[PDB]
Design a protein around this ligand. Structure first.
Ligand SMILES: O=c1cc(N2CCOCC2)oc2c(-c3ccccc3)cccc12
Length: 269
């Protein structure tokens, strides 16, 4: 009985990924997110079959982390309903950046660092997000913690090649656009490259396929030499030339990161 446990709220937003509503678990007023997904629209199914999101989230969730947790899910004749956690107050990185524009490097460092830990956790649990970007990143405004959301385009992590991709094009790597082929970890680093640039410049670097395959990065804002360096490194044209998660976090620009709470007190409150 879904209609009895949760009290549906306003529509938060929708897309090809389905519709998401705000809500509260009657059981204890816990704020949640209710995601609806029509079966006719699912492209990848996992194991009883279910939408990828459910399989992936079940592999990571367990335990504390920077990934939105799957509280529960229900199957209906023509769709699935996912109960995701919902932090309040909250705002996604997209709206946050659109509001304040370019983020200060100290804040960008704290945020970027949390995303790195989040992604490392996913990969560590055999899950590959495949659509990392500002929209899929939520900010818990009080604790200054970031959450990774929407694993609708994700997949199980593997070391062999990937020939399918249903993520955000402007965030996709040169190898995908030129050969419809890419490897998990490396394509992930590239999108992280776009993300960092988005954070420190207030916008994504490439808009057209030409720009992506050319891989020339131009800065419209003042960014430190080191940050500019880490960004161009993640955006290397040759996948094997990109850094490992370990190399990124060991990067000079990634040192002396702030704690989530500190980040909140200084930049969010
Ligand atoms: O998978 C998810 C998809 C979404 N949606 C996708 C459509 O646009 C609006 C955000 O939102 C989620 C949220 C959430 C986002 C913003 C505000 C409040 C809750 C919390 C947990 C999981 C999800």
């Amino acid at each position: 009985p879904l209609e009895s446990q949760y009290q549906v709220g306003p529509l938060l937003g929708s897309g090809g990924f389905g519709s998401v509503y705000s809500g509260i678990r009657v059981s204890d007023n816990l704020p949640v997110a209710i995601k609806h997904v029509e079966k006719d629209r699912i492209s990848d199914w996992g194991e009883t079959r279910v939408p990828m999101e459910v399989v992936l989230l079940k592999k990571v969730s367990s335990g504390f982390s920077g990934v939105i947790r799957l509280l529960d899910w229900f199957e209906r004749p023509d769709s699935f309903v996912l109960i995701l956690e919902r932090p309040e107050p909250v705002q996604d990185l997209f709206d946050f950046i659109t509001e304040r524009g370019a983020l200060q490097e100290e804040l960008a460092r704290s945020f970027f660092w949390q995303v790195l830990e989040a992604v490392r956790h996913c990969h560590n649990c055999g899950v590959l997000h495949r659509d990392i970007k500002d929209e899929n990143i939520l900010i818990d405004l009080n604790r200054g913690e970031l959450k990774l959301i929407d694993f609708g385009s994700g997949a199980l992590l593997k070391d062999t090649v990937y020939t399918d991709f249903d993520g955000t094009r402007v965030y996709s790597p040169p190898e995908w656009i030129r050969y419809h082929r890419y490897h998990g970890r490396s394509a992930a680093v590239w999108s992280l490259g776009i993300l960092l640039y988005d954070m420190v410049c207030g916008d994504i670097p490439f808009e057209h396929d030409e720009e992506i395959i050319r891989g020339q990065v131009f800065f419209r804002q003042r960014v430190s030499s080191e940050c500019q360096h880490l960004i161009r490194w993640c955006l290397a044209l040759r996948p094997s030339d990109r850094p490992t998660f370990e190399e990124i976090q060991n990067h000079p620009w990634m040192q002396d990161v702030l704690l989530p709470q500190e980040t909140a007190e200084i930049h969010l409150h």
